[PDB]
Design an enzyme around this catalytic site. Sequence first.
Site, PDB file in Angstrom:
ATOM      1  N   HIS A  54       0.830  -1.201   0.000  1.00 18.85           N
ATOM      2  CA  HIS A  54       0.000   0.000   0.000  1.00 18.85           C
ATOM      3  C   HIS A  54       0.876   1.268   0.000  1.00 18.85           C
ATOM      4  O   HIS A  54       0.824   1.954  -1.011  1.00 18.85           O
ATOM      5  CB  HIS A  54      -1.054  -0.016   1.129  1.00 18.85           C
ATOM      6  CG  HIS A  54      -1.691   1.317   1.399  1.00 18.85           C
ATOM      7  ND1 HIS A  54      -2.753   1.775   0.644  1.00 18.85           N
ATOM      8  CD2 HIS A  54      -1.386   2.246   2.337  1.00 18.85           C
ATOM      9  CE1 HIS A  54      -3.051   2.966   1.138  1.00 18.85           C
ATOM     10  NE2 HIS A  54      -2.248   3.294   2.152  1.00 18.85           N
ATOM     11  N   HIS A  78       4.131   6.626   6.187  1.00 17.69           N
ATOM     12  CA  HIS A  78       3.022   7.308   6.877  1.00 17.69           C
ATOM     13  C   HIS A  78       2.232   6.394   7.841  1.00 17.69           C
ATOM     14  O   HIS A  78       1.553   6.903   8.727  1.00 17.69           O
ATOM     15  CB  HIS A  78       2.080   8.043   5.894  1.00 17.69           C
ATOM     16  CG  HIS A  78       1.094   7.153   5.211  1.00 17.69           C
ATOM     17  ND1 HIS A  78       1.466   6.337   4.155  1.00 17.69           N
ATOM     18  CD2 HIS A  78      -0.216   6.956   5.475  1.00 17.69           C
ATOM     19  CE1 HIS A  78       0.378   5.671   3.813  1.00 17.69           C
ATOM     20  NE2 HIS A  78      -0.663   6.015   4.573  1.00 17.69           N
ATOM     21  N   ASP A  79       2.348   5.067   7.697  1.00 19.75           N
ATOM     22  CA  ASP A  79       1.646   4.136   8.579  1.00 19.75           C
ATOM     23  C   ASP A  79       2.550   3.448   9.604  1.00 19.75           C
ATOM     24  O   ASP A  79       2.080   2.541  10.280  1.00 19.75           O
ATOM     25  CB  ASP A  79       0.899   3.067   7.766  1.00 19.75           C
ATOM     26  CG  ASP A  79      -0.353   3.570   7.085  1.00 19.75           C
ATOM     27  OD1 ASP A  79      -1.019   4.465   7.652  1.00 19.75           O
ATOM     28  OD2 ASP A  79      -0.673   3.068   5.984  1.00 19.75           O
ATOM     29  N   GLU A  82       1.747   4.991  13.760  1.00 16.29           N
ATOM     30  CA  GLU A  82       0.583   4.520  14.491  1.00 16.29           C
ATOM     31  C   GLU A  82       0.403   2.993  14.433  1.00 16.29           C
ATOM     32  O   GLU A  82       0.184   2.381  15.483  1.00 16.29           O
ATOM     33  CB  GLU A  82      -0.689   5.270  14.042  1.00 16.29           C
ATOM     34  CG  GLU A  82      -1.108   5.027  12.598  1.00 16.29           C
ATOM     35  CD  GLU A  82      -0.523   5.915  11.509  1.00 16.29           C
ATOM     36  OE1 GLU A  82      -1.319   6.548  10.778  1.00 16.29           O
ATOM     37  OE2 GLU A  82       0.723   5.962  11.366  1.00 16.29           O
ATOM     38  N   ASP A  83       0.530   2.368  13.238  1.00 13.89           N
ATOM     39  CA  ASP A  83       0.335   0.918  13.113  1.00 13.89           C
ATOM     40  C   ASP A  83       1.516   0.064  13.580  1.00 13.89           C
ATOM     41  O   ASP A  83       1.387  -1.160  13.651  1.00 13.89           O
ATOM     42  CB  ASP A  83      -0.056   0.528  11.678  1.00 13.89           C
ATOM     43  CG  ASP A  83      -1.283   1.243  11.147  1.00 13.89           C
ATOM     44  OD1 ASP A  83      -2.035   1.824  11.967  1.00 13.89           O
ATOM     45  OD2 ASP A  83      -1.500   1.214   9.908  1.00 13.89           O
ATOM     46  N   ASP A 143      -3.028   8.494  -0.723  1.00 15.07           N
ATOM     47  CA  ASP A 143      -3.317   7.420   0.226  1.00 15.07           C
ATOM     48  C   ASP A 143      -4.802   7.071   0.134  1.00 15.07           C
ATOM     49  O   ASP A 143      -5.139   5.902  -0.040  1.00 15.07           O
ATOM     50  CB  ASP A 143      -2.939   7.845   1.655  1.00 15.07           C
ATOM     51  CG  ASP A 143      -3.539   6.973   2.736  1.00 15.07           C
ATOM     52  OD1 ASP A 143      -2.954   5.905   3.029  1.00 15.07           O
ATOM     53  OD2 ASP A 143      -4.613   7.346   3.272  1.00 15.07           O
TER      54      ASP A 143
HETATM   55  N1  LIG Z   1      -9.291  -0.015   1.452  1.00 14.62           N
HETATM   56  C1  LIG Z   1      -8.620  -0.922   2.192  1.00 14.62           C
HETATM   57  N2  LIG Z   1      -8.213  -0.566   3.433  1.00 14.62           N
HETATM   58  C2  LIG Z   1      -7.532  -1.427   4.225  1.00 14.62           C
HETATM   59  C3  LIG Z   1      -7.255  -2.766   3.693  1.00 14.62           C
HETATM   60  N3  LIG Z   1      -6.584  -3.426   4.640  1.00 14.62           N
HETATM   61  C4  LIG Z   1      -6.440  -2.590   5.690  1.00 14.62           C
HETATM   62  N4  LIG Z   1      -7.002  -1.397   5.452  1.00 14.62           N
HETATM   63  C5  LIG Z   1      -6.990  -0.283   6.439  1.00 14.62           C
HETATM   64  O1  LIG Z   1      -8.271  -0.058   7.027  1.00 14.62           O
HETATM   65  C6  LIG Z   1      -8.297   1.283   7.516  1.00 14.62           C
HETATM   66  C7  LIG Z   1      -9.726   1.812   7.505  1.00 14.62           C
HETATM   67  O2  LIG Z   1      -9.857   2.746   8.573  1.00 14.62           O
HETATM   68  P1  LIG Z   1     -11.062   2.710   9.644  1.00 14.62           P
HETATM   69  O3  LIG Z   1     -12.289   3.255   8.960  1.00 14.62           O
HETATM   70  O4  LIG Z   1     -10.558   3.376  10.901  1.00 14.62           O
HETATM   71  O5  LIG Z   1     -11.318   1.148   9.925  1.00 14.62           O
HETATM   72  P2  LIG Z   1     -10.738   0.412  11.230  1.00 14.62           P
HETATM   73  O6  LIG Z   1     -11.377   1.104  12.402  1.00 14.62           O
HETATM   74  O7  LIG Z   1     -11.182  -1.014  11.049  1.00 14.62           O
HETATM   75  O8  LIG Z   1      -9.250   0.615  11.122  1.00 14.62           O
HETATM   76  C8  LIG Z   1      -7.345   2.084   6.640  1.00 14.62           C
HETATM   77  O9  LIG Z   1      -6.449   2.845   7.442  1.00 14.62           O
HETATM   78  P3  LIG Z   1      -5.827   4.234   6.921  1.00 14.62           P
HETATM   79  O10 LIG Z   1      -4.916   3.958   5.751  1.00 14.62           O
HETATM   80  O11 LIG Z   1      -5.255   4.983   8.095  1.00 14.62           O
HETATM   81  O12 LIG Z   1      -7.128   5.020   6.407  1.00 14.62           O
HETATM   82  P4  LIG Z   1      -8.105   5.798   7.418  1.00 14.62           P
HETATM   83  O13 LIG Z   1      -7.943   5.147   8.771  1.00 14.62           O
HETATM   84  O14 LIG Z   1      -7.620   7.220   7.340  1.00 14.62           O
HETATM   85  O15 LIG Z   1      -9.467   5.570   6.819  1.00 14.62           O
HETATM   86  C9  LIG Z   1      -6.617   1.046   5.807  1.00 14.62           C
HETATM   87  O16 LIG Z   1      -5.198   1.210   5.814  1.00 14.62           O
HETATM   88  C10 LIG Z   1      -7.732  -3.081   2.333  1.00 14.62           C
HETATM   89  O17 LIG Z   1      -7.523  -4.199   1.831  1.00 14.62           O
HETATM   90  N5  LIG Z   1      -8.388  -2.133   1.664  1.00 14.62           N
HETATM   91 MN   LIG Z   2      -2.711   4.081   4.813  1.00 15.52          MN
END
Ligand SMILES: Nc1nc2c(ncn2[C@@H]2O[C@H](COP(=O)(O)OP(=O)(O)O)[C@@H](OP(=O)(O)OP(=O)(O)O)[C@H]2O)c(=O)[nH]1
Ligand SMILES: [Mn+2]
Length: 687
Positions: A54, A78-79, A82-83, A143
């Site tokens: 990603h 960027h991840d 936190e992750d 992103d």
């Molecule tokens: N679309 C997609 N997302 C995935 C996948 N696997 C993991 N993710 C992660 O899921 C996060 C969705 O954020 P949330 O809406 O907070 O869901 P959550 O509480 O289950 O983490 C994303 O974090 P993030 O990058 O920080 O985005 P966000 O938290 O700003 O939405 C993204 O990186 C995938 O296969 N597809």
């Molecule tokens: Mn991300």
Amino acid sequence: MPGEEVSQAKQQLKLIIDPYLSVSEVEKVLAACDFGDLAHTGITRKSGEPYILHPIAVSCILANMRLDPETLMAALLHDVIEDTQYTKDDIIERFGQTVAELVDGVTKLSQSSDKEYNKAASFRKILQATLQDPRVIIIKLADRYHNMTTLGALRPDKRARIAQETFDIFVPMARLVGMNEMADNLENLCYQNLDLDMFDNVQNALLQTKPERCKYQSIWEQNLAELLHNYHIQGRIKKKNNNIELLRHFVKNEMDLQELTHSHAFEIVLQSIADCDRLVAALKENFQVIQYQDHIRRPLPGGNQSLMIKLKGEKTTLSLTIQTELMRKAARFGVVLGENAPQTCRSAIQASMQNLNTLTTFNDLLDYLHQEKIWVYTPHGQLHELPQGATVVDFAYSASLFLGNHAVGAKVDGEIKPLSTPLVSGQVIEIITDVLATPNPDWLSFINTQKARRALQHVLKDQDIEEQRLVGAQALSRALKLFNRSINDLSDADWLDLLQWRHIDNKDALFEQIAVGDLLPQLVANHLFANDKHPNSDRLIQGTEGIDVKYAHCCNPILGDPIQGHLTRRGLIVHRIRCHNLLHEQHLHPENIMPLQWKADDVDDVRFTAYLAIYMAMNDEQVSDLIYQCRKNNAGVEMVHSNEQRTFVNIVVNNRKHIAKVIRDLRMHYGFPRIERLDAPAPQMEI
Ligand SMILES: Nc1nc2c(ncn2[C@@H]2O[C@H](COP(=O)(O)OP(=O)(O)O)[C@@H](OP(=O)(O)OP(=O)(O)O)[C@H]2O)c(=O)[nH]1
Ligand SMILES: [Mn+2]
Ligand SMILES: [Cl-]
Ligand SMILES: [Zn+2]
């Protein structure tokens, strides 16, 4: 196979950066890819592929836009803050302060699914982060884009709230920063997840009618070329993609396959404004006018000029944007993906933020933009936006007067913390109250919000004059504890400076100003102990650490201007040193006037609006050239208007040195007309 997937994705990024980045810069970007691969070792996405794929894909989107190495490194990491177990200090170590701030900034724009989604608060926070460093919003848009393409792996429950946030803020934000292709792609993916059935019906019709629409767009490009020739107008015609406009329409309208096939968009680049009006007149003769917008006489916020006319000829509908060669060139100053660096786009982004208005909300944002707030939450997920340095008491009063007046303690993230505890963004705060509790006046020592301070001063409004002087001393002694000092540590020389600085005679009168007046004990402490070990330095004005300040709308002070503050029941109001409102209150109450200095004469992450009155009449071409000259000098054109005696221009500049350069360059360009700088916008334009 798992590590081989990462390597072939890393190799695809190397192909993109090798041509435009130096050998050392490519090694730094590839080192960030290896570190990101290490931090996310073993972690896999919902679809199953390794996590690092990603940020690699995100960094590839940015590398294709020829963005700087810091932007690419920050996207690759960027991840990891936190992750992963890795911290901001790990990033500062291996890659420097700039990439750490970019990673930090991007991380701050993340929305927790268990926290409140407030559209207005998110818009403000994103706009602030954008104007602090536009690279942050570009990384966040890339992103979000990659996430939208892989939304299929997320549950259909999750797919809606993210598509809604993207549609509400990310789509308008990408248009604001000139990333219109990105915005269109994001909007398309938003329709795919907000109305899958209607999206599939419109997309299939667009696909089936695509070759027929190509044929008729080619026909109309030739008809328009012939029309320009017949009316003796010299111009260029550009075929424009209209897929998002067609999808946006037929998702909410009944399907008309003839309208979908015979709807085309074009851009017409003419030589002069007279030719633009001549072409409009010619088009009216041959077509029926559906819609017309004159952005030449009334330019868009930012300075963009164009003539937008929607025409109908039988089955055919044409959307044309007509502009001069100069208007087209002026428009390419401020676009974050253009020839200019994204950071130089700050003035343009801020001048055109008036295009997003959903209410006069993006009208008085200056205090918010220059002073980053903290985002703390109620145990229910409710957002509270507080000034930096806000304590648990400030949160309690923000929630309600009951919680503030009856507060006894708080539980920060489950842990009991006292009432003076300064808050940090992301914390969940549970105020613990007692209906028999009374607010303690000593709270004034650490209080930084006006709701809390005024509510406490209501308790002292019915107290003894001697007890007030005691409360004021109690509040000042605790404010000094932040610097490891106290009232007993104050020398006679320190007291003599305070009494002269506050136009007062006795120590008791200084305590009265802290307890009952509008003098905050933090400003007294910040004056005695200046720039030494004060516990994110967002502060543009010296000695205003821990407190929020406001810019006066009467004089509108800009960075670099000599300024003076005015202590009011609404906080500290910054005014220009010779503002008639300021001098009136200084004459009546000199004790409420505090001299102020700007921390640095030239801070690059802030922008202000300057108001100009050019003493000359300008015609259509002269106004168009004025917008061009302003934008070419990294100053955004918020608004322009010209009567027969004068021309007014509201311009977004960095500081007083920048406005001096703009005025000097505009004067020699226009034959040295008189240019005066106004305190506030003229009544002829707005006001
Ligand atoms: N679309 C997609 N997302 C995935 C996948 N696997 C993991 N993710 C992660 O899921 C996060 C969705 O954020 P949330 O809406 O907070 O869901 P959550 O509480 O289950 O983490 C994303 O974090 P993030 O990058 O920080 O985005 P966000 O938290 O700003 O939405 C993204 O990186 C995938 O296969 N597809
Ligand atoms: Mn991300
Ligand atoms: Cl005048
Ligand atoms: Zn003023």
